[PDB]
Design a protein around this ligand. Structure first.
Ligand SMILES: [Ca+2]
Ligand SMILES: [Cl-]
Ligand code: NA
Ligand code: NA
Ligand code: NA
Ligand code: NA
Ligand code: NA
Ligand code: NA
Length: 473
């Protein structure tokens, strides 16, 4: 029968297992025989200490590169401040070696782990693209605990080379099954940022992962948005436990924190899931996450039930990842049908926003055509608008099934007069709904100011299929 790891700090890894039900249910996956064997994960970050006592056994040079210095060796640059400890901490969450008398264990403690040194220098579009596109037929899963600064006032995302890397990855990566891109949703909670204003997390090609504290609350750093898919545990207040992992200079830390710690745990769980079914496509993986993730005991004021009976929150997506449930569902999973894309231009004329604008449109979702969608995956409202103070806007999208997605909440620090230029606000909250019928877009001025602007384009973009639905929850 299964024997849990004996590592010295494993008992402190509260988020991996416990009696309490406040965990990611990882031991249950281990007991089913899945520990990440055969799977390759790469940490895109500031480097990886490849000789660390708890990483060396799992290290994979084929999953590693130094894009900052342009050589194969991803070793972190040592400094007095230990600036470049971040990637090593993330790597240990995924794949720290088990049963070796050192530190704790990775979620997928038998997976192969690499790192791309790419944050320690000027991070250009080209740098991102070379990192995201690294050895895509060897690396299965990419983990990114980085992005635009979450200052609550900018709109930023992948430029051309990085976006091309995402499409090449999901199309041709992993033998055509698609690279798995795991993203940390952000740490701009205190700045009141929205993760839909971040093109990396807002992307359909990335699994954006948010955080919950040990006591099941929304952490101070957490950002709410409709593009988030799911949640893993991370740090909270000083009474709540934190993340245990490998640290720079061959040390062990019990104080890894923030949005940074959530993505790697997700990547580890996804590694166990790929071991259970190597044939899963990038879209299969997101389906599994949607079906198996658990809201229960996560506290939020915005939990809503969507059109197919699933609970969803802007703080948490579909809730906590559940590794046991993921690997169970993966084994006999039937591959989803090819992805369809239904493009619907909503406006006939520009519309003044004023104090409040509501745009109602009944759609057929490409009825009678090859891209007919009856089973929604991602939906985007690609919006082009002008406005005098961007952060005063709040934008909601309501699906025909009555699911209200917040595309954009007020951002008090966003004083931009540049509006949005075909920004593709994305929601995961209507996953598996029938998108036929009335969609409603709401744009409102949340301030008392006399603001002004015009919506000039609203493209509703639907992704999904026309087959294979389950009886709702
Ligand atoms: Ca260990
Ligand atoms: Cl597309
Ligand atoms: Na190097
Ligand atoms: Na940009
Ligand atoms: Na493909
Ligand atoms: Na995403
Ligand atoms: Na309908
Ligand atoms: Na209606």
């Amino acid at each position: 029968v299964y024997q849990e790891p004996t590592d010295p700090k494993f008992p402190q890894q509260w988020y991996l297992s416990g009696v309490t039900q406040r965990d990611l249910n990882v031991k249950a996956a281990w007991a089913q025989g899945y520990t990440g064997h055969g799977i390759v994960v790469s940490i895109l970050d500031d480097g990886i200490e490849k000789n660390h006592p708890d990483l060396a056994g799992n290290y994979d040079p084929g999953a590693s590169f130094d894009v900052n210095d342009q050589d194969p060796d991803p070793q972190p640059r040592y400094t007095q401040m230990n600036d470049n400890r971040h990637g090593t901490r993330c790597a240990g969450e995924v794949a720290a070696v088990a049963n070796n008398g050192v530190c704790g264990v990775g979620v997928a403690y038998n997976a192969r782990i690499g790192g791309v040194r790419m944050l320690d220098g000027e991070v250009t579009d080209a740098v991102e693209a070379r990192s995201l596109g690294l050895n895509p037929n060897h690396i299965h899963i990419y983990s990114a605990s980085w992005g635009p600064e979450d200052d609550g006032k900018t709109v930023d995302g992948p430029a051309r080379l990085a976006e091309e890397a995402f499409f090449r990855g999901v199309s041709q990566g992993r033998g055509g099954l698609g690279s798995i891109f795991v993203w940390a949703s952000g740490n701009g909670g205190r700045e009141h940022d929205s993760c839909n204003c971040d093109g990396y997390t807002n992307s359909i090609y990335t699994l954006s992962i948010s955080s919950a504290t040990q006591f099941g609350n929304v952490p101070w750093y957490s950002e709410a948005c409709s593009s988030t898919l799911a949640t893993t545990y991370s740090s909270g207040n000083q009474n709540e436990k934190q993340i245990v992992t490998t640290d720079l200079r061959q040390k062990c830390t019990e104080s890894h924190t923030g949005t940074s710690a959530s993505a790697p745990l997700a990547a580890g769980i996804i590694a166990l899931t790929l071991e259970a079914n190597k044939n899963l496509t990038w879209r299969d993986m997101q389906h599994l996450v949607v079906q198996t993730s658990k809201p229960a005991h996560l506290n939020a004021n915005d939990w809503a039930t969507n059109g197919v009976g699933r609970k969803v929150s802007h703080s948490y997506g579909y809730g906590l990842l559940d590794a046991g449930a993921m690997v169970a569902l993966a084994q006999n999973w039937t591959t989803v049908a090819p992805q369809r894309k239904c493009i619907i231009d909503i406006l006939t004329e520009p519309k003044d926003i004023g104090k409040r604008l509501e745009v109602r449109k009944t759609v057929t979702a490409c009825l009678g055509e090859p891209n007919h969608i009856t089973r929604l995956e991602h939906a985007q409202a690609r919006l082009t608008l002008s406005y005098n103070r961007r952060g005063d806007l709040a934008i909601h999208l309501v699906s025909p099934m009555g699911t209200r997605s917040t595309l954009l909440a007020a951002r008090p620090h966003d004083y931009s007069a540049d509006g949005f230029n075909d920004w593709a606000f994305m929601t995961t909250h209507s996953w598996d709904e029938d998108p036929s019928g009335e969609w409603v877009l709401e744009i409102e001025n949340t301030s008392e100011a006399n603001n002004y602007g015009t919506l000039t384009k609203f493209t509703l973009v639907l992704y999904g299929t026309a087959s294979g639905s389950l009886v709702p929850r």
